[PDB]
Design a protein around this ligand. Structure first.
Ligand SMILES: [Mg+2]
Length: 181
């Protein structure tokens, strides 16, 4: 199989590659109207245009800008591009995402959309995945940075609290020495 990512830019060759999830990690979307939504976009489903209300997780702007500076960031979602692409366009104002991967790039393993990290084409000692669903990284439990699922708690500070830990990881030679494998 062809790797999911191209050759790393010279500047990113020695940086860690971070696979970042979309739903319940950076945002929370819904078909039922929500007051004070950040994005309200059209998504076609079976020929009918539906309005999708998207809420941004607190501190996502600070998070993405910082992560984009520290690592070779990659958006990897199990959702379809017709939805994720527009959301990513509205989210990434710093070109933090070096690449965007959707549903088709996941491997449907034992009923779940798994994100096979070996599939990226990056040294596993230099790869991290931020996903609220441990099922997503069943093949790479030791490359994960645990993160809580978010829905609408505007008091949430997980993204802000995770930066210190990512800062730490950006300075180690092998993420396994920290995550432990
Ligand atoms: Mg998710």
């Amino acid at each position: 199989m062809q790797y999911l990512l191209p050759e790393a830019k010279a500047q990113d060759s020695d940086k860690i590659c971070v696979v970042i999830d979309l739903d319940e990690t950076l945002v929370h979307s819904s078909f039922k109207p929500v007051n004070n939504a950040d994005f309200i976009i059209p998504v076609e489903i079976d020929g009918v245009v539906h309005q999708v209300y998207v809420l941004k997780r607190p501190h996502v702007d600070e998070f993405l800008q910082r992560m984009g500076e520290l690592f070779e960031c990659v958006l990897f979602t199990a959702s379809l591009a017709k939805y994720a692409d527009p959301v990513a366009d509205l989210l990434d104002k710093w070109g933090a995402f070096r690449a965007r991967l959707f549903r088709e790039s996941c491997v449907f393993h034992r009923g779940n959309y798994v994100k096979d990290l070996s599939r990226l084409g990056r040294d596993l000692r230099r790869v991290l995945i931020l996903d609220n669903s441990p099922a997503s990284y069943v093949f790479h439990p030791d490359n994960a940075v645990p993160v809580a699922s978010w829905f609408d708690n505007m008091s949430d500070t997980e993204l802000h609290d995770l930066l210190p830990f990512f800062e730490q990881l950006s300075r180690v030679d092998d993420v396994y020495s920290v995550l432990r494998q």
